Amino acid sequence: ACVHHIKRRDIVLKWELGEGAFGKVFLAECHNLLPEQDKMLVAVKALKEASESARQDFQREAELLTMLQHQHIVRFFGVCTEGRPLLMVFEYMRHGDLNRFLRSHGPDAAGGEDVAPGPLGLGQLLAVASQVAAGMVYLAGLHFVHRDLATRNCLVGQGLVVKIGDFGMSRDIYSTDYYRVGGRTMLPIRWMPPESILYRKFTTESDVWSFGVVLWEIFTYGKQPWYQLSNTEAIDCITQGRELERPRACPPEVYAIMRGCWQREPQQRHSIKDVHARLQALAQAPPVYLDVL
Numbered sequence: 189a190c191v192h193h194i195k196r197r198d199i200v201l202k203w204e205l206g207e208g209a210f211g212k213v214f215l216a217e218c219h220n221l222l223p224e225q226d227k228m229l230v231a232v233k234a235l236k237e238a239s240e241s242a243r244q245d246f247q248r249e250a251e252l253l254t255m256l257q258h259q260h261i262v263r264f265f266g267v268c269t270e271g272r273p274l275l276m277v278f279e280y281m282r283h284g285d286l287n288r289f290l291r292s293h294g295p296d297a298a299g300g301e302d303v304a305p306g307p308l309g310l311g312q313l314l315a316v317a318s319q320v321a322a323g324m325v326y327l328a329g330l331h332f333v334h335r336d337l338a339t340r341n342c343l344v345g346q347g348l349v350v351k352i353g354d355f356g357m358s359r360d361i362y363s364t365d366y367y368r369v370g371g372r373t374m375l376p377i378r379w380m381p382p383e384s385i386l387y388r389k390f391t392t393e394s395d396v397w398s399f400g401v402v403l404w405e406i407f408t409y410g411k412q413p414w415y416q417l418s419n420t421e422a423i424d425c426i427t428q429g430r431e432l433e434r435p436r437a438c439p440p441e442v443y444a445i446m447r448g449c450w451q452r453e454p455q456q457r458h459s460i461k462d463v464h465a466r467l468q469a470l471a472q473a474p475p476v477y478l479d480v481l
């Protein structure tokens with residue numbers, strides 16, 4: 189345990205945000221967590237069970253999350269292990285998951301504090317993609333493999349800060365984004381490359397394939413990839429080499445980055461470093477450049 193511990197009394201649950209098979213997520217006040225703030229909001233994941241399996245899991249997940257600290261990874265603050273339920277404390281991200289954020293700022297579009305009215309602009313869509321790519325750079329740096337990279341598994345906070353992370357309930361909230369195979373096995377097939385579906389191999393390079401599909405989601409304002417297709421039809425068309433078609437809002441410049449992630453041969457896919465650098469440069473480009481993309 190390099191894991192930070194937080195006393196139960198410093199956490200006051202306000203209400204539920206979300207619910208899964210393995211736990212609930214609450215919004216809470218946390219006291220004496222940061223210097224500038226004696227009181228701040230957090231999201232708290234409470235473990236449903238607390239058995240031999242659940243608690244050695246929990247202890248591992250706590251170690252991994254303590255190790256992943258970066259500007260575009262959901263901030264993990266620590267655990268509360270003084271009397272059940274066991275709690276994991278996280279930064280509260282007020283716009284929820286990126287898929288929901290994308291859908292509620294789509295081409296059919298309520299502007300507010302963080303976002304213009306209307307559909308998100310090119311500038312905004314690129315700044316989102318760029319942030320997700322920044323988190324994928326940091327994970328690949330540590331040779332960590334995600335395996336479920338999707339907009340649903342990103343969050344959005346104040347200022348449209350976008351960070352990779354979920355509460356491990358995406359299977360329950362987004363059951364349609366998964367193919368159920370086993371009795372309890374659920375594969376994000378629409379996000380997976382041919383080597384992951386055929387050979388069951390998962391690598392850095394299946395993560396960049398999955399990021400290319402995140403980039404497609406972003407530029408379709410959260411549409412499900414292959415939504416027109418069933419699970420079996422999507423497997424067929426992915427293993428047979430069919431590529432998702434350019435989203436309306438996606439400049440050719442950007443459709444090419446998407447295609448660099450989707451080379452059939454893993455070693456041919458561009459590196460995440462290269463993709464970040466392309467999206468950041470676009471995101472930071474002056475309006476005069478962007479207006480003619």
Ligand SMILES: Cc1cccn2c(NC(=O)CN3C(=O)CSc4ccccc43)c(-c3ccccc3)nc12
Pocket residue numbers: 210233249253256261262264276334336352353354355356357
């Ligand atoms: C049960 C399960 C299945 C699939 C993904 N699961 C995750 N999710 C991740 O591990 C996803 N994830 C990265 O894989 C690393 S980035 C990152 C940041 C913050 C949070 C998560 C992250 C969990 C889970 C557990 C405790 C707390 C939170 C999440 N359980 C699951």
